C-alpha cells in the first residue's frame, strides 16, 4: 500500500524527489489527557528559511532534495514552549516521493510510518513520555496549506492531508 497525494497541476515523473525533512507547528492551549499535537507549519517563508536544511528546491511543509542527518533524525526549534516557533525536522533516511504524471504523487506508507515513529520518539524527548499525534494543516494560502514545490518552470500544489493522520503512544 502507498499514500497518495492529489496534486495540481500534474507533476511529471522527473519531478520525483527525496523527502529530507519537514517543518511542524505544535498546537497550543490546555491539552487533554496524554497527547501532544503537531501539524504542518503555520508559519511563512521565514520558518522555512530558519531551518537551513533545504537545497535548491523551494518547498513548503516538506523539504525536497535537501540536507540529510548523519545517523538519526534530529529536531530543532528556537523555543520548544513557544508554539509560534516552528519545529524543524531533519530526517536521516530520505523518503522517496514519486509522481506518476496523472495528478497523483505517491509515497511508501510503511517507510513514512517508519520515519514518523522516529519523529514521534524524538519529540517525546522534548515534551515527555506523551502520545504524539499528527494532524493535517490548519489552513493558509495555497502555497502553505498544500505541499507546494517548484520543478523545472512549474509550481505544484499537493494536498498533504494523508501524510499527517497518525497517532503514536
Amino acid at each position: 500500500d502507498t499514500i497518495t497525494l492529489p496534486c495540481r497541476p500534474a507533476p511529471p515523473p522527473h519531478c520525483s524527489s527525496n523527502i529530507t525533512g519537514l517543518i511542524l507547528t505544535r498546537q497550543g492551549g490546555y491539552s487533554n489527557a496524554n497527547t501532544v499535537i503537531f501539524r504542518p507549519s503555520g508559519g511563512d517563508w521565514r520558518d522555512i528559511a530558519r531551518c537551513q536544511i533545504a537545497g535548491t528546491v523551494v518547498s513548503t511543509q516538506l523539504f525536497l532534495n535537501g540536507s540529510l542527518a548523519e545517523e538519526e533524525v534530529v529536531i530543532r526549534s528556537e523555543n520548544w514552549t513557544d508554539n509560534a516557533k516552528s519545529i524543524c525536522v531533519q530526517l536521516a533516511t530520505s523518503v522517496e516521493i514519486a509522481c506518476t504524471g496523472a495528478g497523483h504523487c505517491a509515497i511508501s506508507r510503511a517507510k513514512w510510518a517508519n520515519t514518523l515513529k522516529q519523529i514521534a520518539s524524538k519529540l517525546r524527548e522534548q515534551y515527555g513520555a506523551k502520545t504524539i499525534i499528527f494532524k493535517p494543516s490548519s489552513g493558509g494560502d495555497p502555497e502553505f496549506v498544500n505541499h507546494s514545490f517548484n520543478c523545472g518552470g512549474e509550481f505544484f500544489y499537493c494536498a498533504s492531508t494523508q501524510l499527517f493522520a497518525s497517532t503514536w503512544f
Partner: antibody
Amino acid sequence: QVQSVQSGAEVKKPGASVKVSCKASGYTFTGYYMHWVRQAPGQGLEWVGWINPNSGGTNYAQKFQGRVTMTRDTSISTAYMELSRLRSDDTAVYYCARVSQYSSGWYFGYWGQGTLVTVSS
Amino acid sequence: IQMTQSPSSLSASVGDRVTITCQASQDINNYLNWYQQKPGKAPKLLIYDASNLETGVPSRFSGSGSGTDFTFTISSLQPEDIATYYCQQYEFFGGGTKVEIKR
C-alpha cells in the same frame, strides 16, 4: 493614534456563527502575529489562537479546534475570527492583540477595544 | 502549564503596599508578564520578563521572581490602580487578582 479597532457587539442564536473583525489603524500586519483572547463576563482571559498574516497559517487552542476559523485581509490590514456552532458558553468579550513575530516571547500589545458576543435563543 | 495566581481578591487602602503572587508549576525562567485590566477596558502590559517595566508605566509598579515563584508589587496604591491583574506566559494566563478598596 495607532490602535486596533474591532467590530461592534453582536448577538447570535445558539448553533449559529459570528464573524468578528479587527482592523489595524496606523500599522500593518506584516511584522506581527495576531492573537485572539476571549473573556467571559466575570471570568479570566482565555487564548483562542493566532494567525500568520503572511501565510494565513493558524494555530487554534485545542478547545476550539473544530469550530473556530481565523482569516485576514492584507489589502485592508484586518484580521477576522469566525466561531461556528455557537453555544451559551461562548458568551464573552473577544479581544484581538498584537504579538511580534521576531520576539522570543509573547508580549500582548495593542489590544482591541473588545467585542461582546452574546449567545441566546 | 498551570497558572496559580493568588489571592483571588484583596482590599487595600490608598498608600499601602500591594503584593500579588503568581507561581507556575514548571520552570519558565525569568519570562513572565503582568497585565492590568481596568473594568470595561482591555488588558494593559505593565511588567514584562518578571522584573522589567514597559515604557509609560509609573515606577510604583514592580515585579520580581525567577523559576516558578513570581511576585507583583505596587509600592504605593493610587486611585488609578484599582483593577484586576493577570500574569501571562505564552497562551496561558493566571486566574487574576482583583484589587479592591478597604473601608
